[PDB]
Structures are given as C-alpha cells and as structure tokens.
Design a protein around this nucleic acid. Sequence first.
RNA 1: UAUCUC
Length: 282
Amino acid sequence: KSFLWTQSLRRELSGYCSNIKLQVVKDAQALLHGLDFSEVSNVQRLMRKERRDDNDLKRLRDLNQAVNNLVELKSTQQKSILRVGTLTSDDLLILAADLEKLKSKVWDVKNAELLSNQFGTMPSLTLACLTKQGQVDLNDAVQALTDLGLIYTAKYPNTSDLDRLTQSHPILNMIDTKKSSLNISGYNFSLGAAVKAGACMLDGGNMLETIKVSPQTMDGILKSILKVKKALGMFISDTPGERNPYENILYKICLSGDGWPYIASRTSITGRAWENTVVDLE
RNA sequence: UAUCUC
Ligand code: NI
Ligand code: NI
C-alpha cells in the first residue's frame, strides 16, 4: 500500500515535479571542490557513535553550515499561515489535525532543538561523498544512482536490488546496508539516501523528490495531497516508529514554503513542520 | 534527529 501511496502522489503532483538532475550535479561538484572531506570523515565517524554529545552535534552543525554555503538547492526559512481559499474550511481542519498528530508522535545535549533539520539527506551531498570516498568520477556515481532511480519508478528498491546493481556499478559497494543505521546523518551512506538521489537523476518520472514549493504554490500542492489522502484513505500513523509516504510528504512540505522539500539543504531551517506551517481556521 | 531496514 505504501508504494501505491507514493505512486498516487506522483501522479497527482506531476505538475510540481521537474528535472533537477543537472542542478543536483552542479551542487555535487561544488561540494567536491569546496568541502573539507577529512572533516566529512570525522563527522561520519562521530555520528556513528552509540552515545553522542554536544561536541559531536557542533561538529555536525558546522559541517552542515559549510555544505549549505556551497549549494544552490536550498530551502529557506518560510513560515506559512494557511487560510481559506484554494483550501476549503474542511481541508484546513484536516491539515491542522494531521499536523497536530505529527507533533503528538542516544544523545547527551543541553538543547535538543539544535538537532532539528541537521540530520537530513541531500542528493548532492550523497553524490559528492560517494564520488570522493568511492574514488570514482562523479559521472560513475551519477550513472549508478540513475539505475537505482529507475528501479524506484517501479518499486522501493531493497538490499537485493542493490546487490544486483552493484554487479554492474561497483561504486554502490560504498553503501553497506549492514552498516546503515537510523539518525546517523546524510554524510553516512544508506540505501534510502541513494534512492532519494537516484530519484533526481531521471528525465521525467514524476518523482516526488524533485518537487519545488513556493509560497504561491503551497496551497495547491497541499490541496493535491489532500485529494490523494481522500482517494486512498491515507493517514498519519499513531505509532511513533513508522513513517509512511503521507506523513513524509506532509512533514517535508510544511517545514518550509520555499525550497525543495525532499532534496534541498534544509540545515539553516529552524523549527518543525507543525511550527512552520500553521492554520487559521478563522 | 524527517532519518534506517521492509
Ligand atoms: Ni574541477
Ligand atoms: Ni547501469
């Protein structure tokens, strides 16, 4: 059902998707030229520790700022106050309740808010890190991830899909699914981040990953999502562990009214989706 | 932690 949700969202939001491959590639090249990869190595290791502290977090945050300064695909602080118009009163109540649900759902740090928006995955960073650490040409990484994107037009790629691909694209050996883990940052490799990057490598395909939001399109994008929510009966799961495609898109869109919700640098953003998008039920 | 694996 999950892939069906993703598929139905792609169909419905096709008009907000676009080709961003060369823009991602340009950002990846900017990182390859400008990034301190010894510190990338340092942050990767630090993020993999069983127990992390404010020292580790500062290292992540500083590196993030450096990455953010180099790339052009960035999301910016943009609060949205949703009001009736494109969205009906009923729609606003649905969105309000779902954001409230999202809100309702080891680190040793003084301020947990400094974790917010620092742990995301960005295709350009993924490409840069694979290319540099995998010791191949950027194009080698691009071609490999393109195949992964193609698989993603048909299904969620899994470890087996990945294993098969590696037979023709050895760079993908950098992605050790055994070593991948939750919340270890976009500097470390994972199948999920590789799939997100592959999704940007395609010509067409209506990949959600390529969506751009602006204040002028925010309401229409939300209205389209709500159409699909109704059609397929999508919902925010009450279990604080699962994250389905609807929760995923709603959170990512509502984090900012200006940017690329899935793939931009979002490390300059403060706040969570339920703080950055609010509803005036009036 | 908008992230892991399916
Ligand atoms: Ni050069
Ligand atoms: Ni290939």
